[PDB]
Specification:
Elements: H1 3-11, E1 14-19, E2 25-28, E3 31-34, H2 39-50, H3 60-80, H4 85-90, H5 93-112, H6 115-122, H7 126-134, H8 137-141, H9 143-155
Antiparallel strand pairs: 1-2, 2-3
PDB class: hydrolase
Keywords: T4 Lysozyme, cavity, hydrolase
Assembly: monomeric
Amino acid sequence: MNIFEALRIDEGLRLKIYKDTEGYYTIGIGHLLTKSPSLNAAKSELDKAIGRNTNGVITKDEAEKLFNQDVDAAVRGILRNAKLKPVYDSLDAVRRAALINMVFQMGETGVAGFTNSLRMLQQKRWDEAAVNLAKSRWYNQTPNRAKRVITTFRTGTWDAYKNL
């Protein structure tokens, strides 16, 4: 199990524009196109991101290319953020993947607002961080996914993702 396989489980794969859990236009493996309500705006962002006139449908190879770019961007965003980088440097490799998962979903700014949970993680107070992480909009809106991520932080294993 690694971050690419975990995210593919948590986000799925769709080759035509769809709306994500918040109603935003999305394609591929969790690639957010726009927060605007205009499907025409969304198709134009897709054409810009892929480099051709798509009409709303991409290939699998195109979706994997977007996914590689987005996982790379999430890692580089953590390592440039002054609240996230010391947490990331303190964790083992499995818990680092859990942090990249959150950043992929919510963005670097949103994860950096979990001030109290990040402090617990840095202190390795796993059970107390798990409770604090669940007191969040993220957990109430996507509880099955948030539970898998929170279990990964609690245990340091990939158990929440095997059997899927």
